[PDB]
């Protein structure tokens, strides 16, 4: 009677659902859901990459609090999360896919498998289908049982070359559409959900696609013509990007078209190459949509659609060639701006939210809706007021994101160039109505983007005419960090009668 | 072979040992130790009051990390501390006094005595003598057994009135000097240490005095003439103090001479009153000094002096009427500037350190000296290079302190006047060679004190001529927060072979 | 290169593989494995029912040590088990089916799903396929997706009635053979194991069948003619069984043919009924065998058969009408005597073991073979010496089993009749070469079965001619309990240099 | 309002307070308390020695359950004890002395001081004064400060030799009576208890004396003439003792007069020697008595006597030359029979209890009286009904004791002579109204003592006339083990609504 369906699409841009790229991709099921629900237009990931972003989404805390700042950085074992809190509400959190959680070494034996991968499922989640990108054993066994020939898992991602053996960038995937990673995970959800109907269930479905190595099964590989797509938003050359801030030198080098596909090691970043990858990515998104329609159809068929809290989002964005860069290890909005659709029984269908919302607001929304206590450790705030077309009077007027550009055992390109250590790798972003401020822990100058001017296309931090804006935004950023320190026990008080707690948000 | 003697005097100002007040107080044993050891002249508490400031000293972390931000705010049970780490080195940490540790409610039964007091001993410490200000059962029993008449513990702190019954502000204490709180604790140390000689011991001895309720046993009560003491450093009136920044309104109103003594509820803050309290305070510091000489004499007599790491400091300072304020719930240096003497076998005797040192540097110094691994959670750095007259090239160039002006269950005077909640109570101080910057989490403007100008006697943050200094120092403060986030697991990495760690400090 | 395949068949009698019933059932794959491996002929479960038996098999301890004495009795969270110990060896224990583990309430939130079922998976096991008898959600969803009509899970177990609607006892199951519980679990193993090939895997496959509610899909339902089967071994009537020991009154009443099937509430225990249930049970065993052949074929096809430790056993026996009783809540051998086949690279193929072996010997055998330390808590001993046709000189000369006939919240039929409480429900069995002794914690007399006389068909404990045998066996039983008390820390010693441990078995 | 005073005298025989030795020793304060309270005449320790016997008293469990079976054998960290349970009731358990608790290696760092001694204080106890026999640092420091000359702690226990330097067996102790171990501990209790008056306190005071090395300060050393004392109860020679059962060979050889004193390595067990040790022991018991009178006087003086639950007992007994043996590593009653006096407001003064009581009954009595839930793990039963002169109808009809004659790292004299390992060291004793039965885990025959015949002076287990009594008592012993298995979670049940518990005791 009270179900929770939490879908995370890895790496889908907000502008593909609504915005600059929306008219160049077919997303009917996601657009039909938005039409029958609440869409959040100013929704941003609080951190990057995949690991820190998921840690934040699943714990409801900023990276400065949860401290799983990089892929492989452990998360404290006693950190309250959506699964642990939903278990207190009597739910068995069902997992279809991955959580990308780096386990606490203090909670396991040194030789335990859980400490050998940063793709490991988070404490509290009950895994029904394991579908981690680097280990998709059920999907790999499915392809082997289907009669697909592959001596290595990496061979599965190589696009089919031409008849003459010539490698083809947008060549169809070695697997048919019905045997794809997207189709298979959806099939596993539909093979396991029927018996859960009637009881209160919590299902967490995580789609990797669209995501590198970029390959799509027939007909999605060529469904979109690269020649009819818009070119990425970028300055004329890679050196013009690096000229805006020295940070962009390592950023445009971190990822490339050559690292986003398998079988093309010497791949040149030409307009033909860039547009092909862009078309493959969009085809993978239409494939995800198609399979999401089947998930929705199942809820309607079982009469469970109206009695379910549906949460659809993307973990982080993707540059997609924008600003001569790929991936999400950068400071531009496209790496953080993510779609968010929430359907709840009695919500305002077709309602569009313009207020800044954060990835950390998801966990408290779910707990609020089920009627479970939100821990004080949670930095995020429930989006429930927005569901009935309203809003809280004391809402955020800016959004905040973090990044870490250090790696403890293998120094990053930024560390090799600028010479900072792994305690000074933190980057912070503050998105104000007019400005975007970027501040580094390391000895790198701030970035300032004026949306009333050139926007993200010009770093104006060195301009003395913007000194008062720079000082005001940086104090606003300083205050945010001071107002959002670890609240696990900071609102508890030791009194003569015992320990007494104060609720963080009223 | 390797002993550790860690003495902490509560509320002793740095300027009493060396500085403005040094010539008005006799501290021969502390000054003799400084002459035979290393003195740290720019040593500051990283937080306040007692509880937070004790949590920082004993954990080696900033309050932003340990999160025991106010008296009664719980400290995480799994937080590494000097006692837990010394236990790994094979030491039994002996406690003579108090730690003022607010226990983790998650680690105890709801009705446990440990959760009813914020004066409770820290995990790992083995208590030999209990001597917490609000308790002191061994000392209270010593007083009853010696035949002192008192129906309430609060009666013990009331100064002896005149023969005619007239209350006397600097009246001698009810107890004789040999029966005092200072004498009794020293006697308990000397009644228990003889059998520890020969074995490697770690003793932690904590003197409350000098500390309110201000009362000194004969002859200390009147040893210093209030009429011959210098007046406090202050602006002419209370309104001049508060005109500098609104924070000082509630800050000068938080403590008073009337709250620093027992039996004078209507006590007027006259110059006669202020100077009397100041003379009583200095008399208690001299009595602490005489008893510390007995502790040193014991080490020399047993031939344990040369083979012992001696650490002598104060937890925090005391305004003592300076700037029309009392206590340590403020932002001025007198509340944080603390004496620090370190004697180690082979140190440079009489060496004076001018580099900025922090209270969090004590725990890593002890661990380094015993040869025990310093946890990555520790924000402080070992002072060991300074002991042989050297100094690390990458050492601190500024000091950092924090305060919390909010109370979750009982709103403070600042909360009542300024309207902020318990998530916005944080204050931060950055002490640069020239400037001191104060920044609030709440919507209160910064403070800026120029030490080449009027010093602390003028807040220059609103002066346009200091706008560039203000912006530069605030970025330096922002970077400090970003460079010192929780390091418990942030330097650990999940690899294909298991979890691997990176050492924080060089 | 070093794999572990651990198969548990729930409720299969030892005499079906080799013995009295072997010639009346086809088990070719299990018999082919025995021909190419080591068979253990005197193998007994140390406890009953399913829960305590599994607890013992998975922990390697007697019920007197693990204390999970009934279905629903919690097992201590820190109890070392095969999964926790295999995780230390670097294995991810893969679960296909169930463990029937009652979780520790001290380790979970009061409202957690893990505390609402005693079928919950054991700590350390990674569940790939959930197949718990009372909740087979993947199998129930498979039947629903296949187009099977059922409004209740209990309807799935009702045998197909005749054309005219007349209920038929050995009617075929509502599901076809390819859609059965046995077939489905085997399919899930084969859908997930291919990608594990090459790496060291540990797979735990648990078959419920043969087990009530007795129903078999076509053609297994009628494959064996009830008219050509031998009748159960029993005294002439139910009252003759109860006359041997008053214990047998509640035992023959606990289970019945009517409780072993669904859709026959008034089912009479006629010879026609008893033989039909017996034929259905044997058909379910041939179905299990058939699917085990597919598991073996997969290992051979992948070239993983010779490099795998294969362990095949049954958890507990089944009375199957023997002694006018059904199930395993009794003291006769048929309830405990279980098949055991172990194949290891380099073992003696076709070797038959006659020495008494216990269910607790499985966990130490696996750990020994992988080269992982066996905890001292483990009461069982490695069967590795028997694999090369040898045996240890200090082996057991008797086997030991336990049962609990109390229920804390709902008093059993034994408690209602004899009037004992839930601290006196323990029963103990000692199987000597000649005698079997049964001793009760409650005020019920012992049982003594002389195999050189009438065997289990006559309780001779009241015969004064057997007083010396009774006294000798009871002292042997007393000594066994005293020699097998909780060894978790009893072999550890606190010394002046620290804690030192002594290995339980050399 | 509700105080708990728990005094434990180490090694005081029951027959010294009332019985065979009572007329040869002055115990006025203990006898005055018995006259104003309830005395338990059939009170026995459930295990031995000190460590196991202290673990049973403080946990309320049999050694078969708590498993700290020898000195140095760790006790599980999560074992509920009197201190942990009293902390739930809001009490701070104050310790004056020792608990002799072997800590759990799983709960501490490998190098922790707590894992280097089996005299370490039990979890939950708040140590006020440390006074363990192998340590006693406060008492050793009291001795150095008072000016006693000793270069080694062992020199303190050497009796003062004659003027000519001739060693004297009953020579006065080096220290004066006012400086003794007994006097000093009492002084520490009285120096710390005054400030606890008014509040609800729980004080645990543990006197080592009477206990080896046997030495008494003047005038106690010679207060009793060894020539006027009765000789021990024994068979004529050592070989007569050992002829009764081979166990007594190593048991009479384990301790001797030479091992019960310091400075006499070649001490002959003559009647003069034996009687001298006996007179010294009785003199130390009289000195314990004088100091207990001061503890009682304090309660009366403060008006806290009538409002306090007073529990006075001994941990175990002492052979004292009886049966040619010393100490408590034996099976005779003198090693277990201990005095027990309980005073509670409203009890029947002068009431004498004859029912069998056990050391495990103390913890549940205290918890019951304070109104705190008794855990199911507790094997003991509250003695509260007996306090008002009543007796439960389902009370004990026999008492049960255990011993362990094995040592994991250093094989005992029994292991060396009989050849059994450290899993077979358990001994069990059952005291019936007429018989005493002794059963070994190792292959040693039982002992049977008829109290209507020769008592303990003849082992009658081999007599055919006692074969039926032997079999009956051994079944009663078997049933006791089966009725008292670990109850930590065995009465908890996993249900569809969660975990539900059943109360152990009626």
Structure in a nutshell:
The structure is a homotetramer of 506-residue chains. Chain A is α/β, with parallel strands linked by helices and 506 residues long. Chain A is built from 14 helices and 15 strands.
Structure description:
- The first copy, chain A, is globular and about 80 Å long.
- Chain A is built from 14 helices and 15 strands.
- By secondary structure, the first copy, chain A, is an alpha/beta fold.
- In chain A, α7 (181-192) runs parallel beside α10 (271-301).
- The first copy, chain A, has an eight-stranded mixed sheet, sandwiched between helices. A five-stranded mixed sheet of chain A has the order 3-10-11-12-13.
- Chain A has two domains: 1-460, Alkaline Phosphatase, subunit A; 461-506, Helix non-globular (Single alpha-helices involved in coiled-coils or other helix-helix interfaces).
- Chains in contact: A-B, A-C, B-D, C-D.
- It is classed as hydrolase.
- Keywords: hydrolase, alakaline phosphatase superfamily, promiscuity.
Taken from the alpha-carbon principal axes, the silhouette of chain A is globular
| DSSP helical segment count of chain A | 14
Radius of gyration of chain A: 22 Å
Number of domains of chain A: 2
Please name the fourth-level CATH homologous superfamily of the largest domain in chain A.
Alkaline Phosphatase, subunit A
Q: Whole-Å distance between the termini of chain A?
A: 27 Å
User: Biggest interface, and residues per chain?
Assistant: A-B, 64 and 64 residues
Q: Percentage of helical residues of chain A?
A: 25-40%
Biggest beta-sheet profile of chain A: 8 strands, mixed
How would you write the strand order of the largest sheet of chain A?
A: 5-4-6-1-7-8-2-9
* Number of distinct beta strands of chain A: 15
Domain Sulfatase N-terminal (chains A, B, C, D): 2-371
InterPro entries (chains A, B, C, D): Alkaline_phosphatase_core_sf (IPR017850), Sulfatase_N (IPR000917)
GO molecular function, one term (chains A, B, C, D): sulfuric ester hydrolase activity
Protein name (chains A, B, C, D): Phosphonate monoester hydrolase, putative
């Amino acid at each position: 009677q009270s179900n929770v369906l939490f879908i995370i699409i890895d790496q889908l841009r907000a502008d593909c659902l609504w915005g600059a790229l929306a008219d160049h991709v077919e997303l009917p099921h996601l657009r039909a859901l938005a039409q029958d629900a609440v869409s959040f237009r100013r929704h941003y990931s609080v951190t990057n990459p995949c690991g820190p972003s998921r840690a934040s989404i699943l714990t409801g805390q900023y990276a400065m609090n949860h401290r799983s700042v990089r892929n492989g950085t452990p998360l404290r074992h006693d950190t309250p999360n959506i699964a642990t809190e939903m278990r207190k509400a009597g739910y068995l959190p069902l997992l279809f896919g991955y959580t990308d959680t780096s386990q606490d070494p203090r909670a396991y034996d040194a030789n335990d498998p859980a400490l050998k991968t940063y793709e490991f499922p988070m404490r509290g989640f009950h895994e029904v289908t394991e579908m981690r990108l680097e280990m998709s054993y059920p999907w790999q066994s499915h392809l082997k049982n289907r009669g697909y020939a592959f001596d290595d898992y990496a061979q599965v991602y190589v696009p089919r070359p031409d008849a003459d053996g010539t490698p083809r960038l947008n060549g169809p995937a070695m697997y048919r559409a019905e045997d794809s990673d997207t189709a298979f995970l959806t099939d596993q959800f539909l093979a396991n959900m029927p018996a859960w109907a009637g009881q209160n269930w919590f299902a967490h479905l995580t789609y990797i696609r669209p995501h590198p190595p970029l390959v799509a099964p027939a007909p999605y590989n060529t469904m979109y013509d690269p020649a009819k797509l818009p070119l990425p938003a970028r300055l004329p050359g890679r050196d013009d990007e690096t000229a805006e801030h020295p940070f962009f030198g390592p950023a445009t080098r971190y990822s490339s078209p050559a690292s986003f596909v398998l079988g093309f090691p010497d791949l040149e970043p030409t307009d033909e190459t860039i547009q092909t990858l862009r078309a493959v990515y969009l085809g993978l998104a239409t494939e995800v949509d198609t399979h999401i329609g089947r998930v929705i159809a199942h809820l309607k068929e079982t009469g469970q659609y109206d009695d379910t809290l549906i949460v659809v989002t993307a973990d982080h964005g993707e540059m997609l060639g924008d600003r001569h860069s790929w991936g999400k290890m950068t400071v531009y909005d496209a790496a953080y701006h993510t779609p968010l659709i929430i359907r709840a029984p009695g919500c305002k269908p077709g309602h569009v939210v313009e207020a800044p919302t954060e990835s950390i607001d998801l966990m408290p929304t779910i707990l609020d809706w089920v009627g479970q206590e939100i821990p004080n450790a949670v930095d995020g705030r429930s989006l429930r007021p927005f569901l009935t077309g309203e809003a809280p009077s004391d809402w955020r007027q800016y959004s905040f994101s973090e990044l870490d550009i250090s790696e403890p055992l293998d120094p990053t390109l930024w560390q090799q160039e600028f010479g900072f250590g792994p305690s000074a790798g933190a980057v912070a972003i503050l998105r104000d109505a007019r400005f975007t401020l970027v501040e580094f822990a390391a000895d790198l100058p701030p970035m300032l983007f004026d949306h009333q001017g050139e926007g993200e296309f010009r770093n104006v931090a060195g301009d003395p005419a913007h000194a008062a804006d720079l000082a005001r935004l940086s104090r606003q950023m300083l205050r945010h960090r001071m107002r959002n320190m670890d609240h696990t026990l900071s609102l508890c008080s030791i009194t003569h009668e015992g320990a007494r707690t104060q609720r963080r948000y009223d």
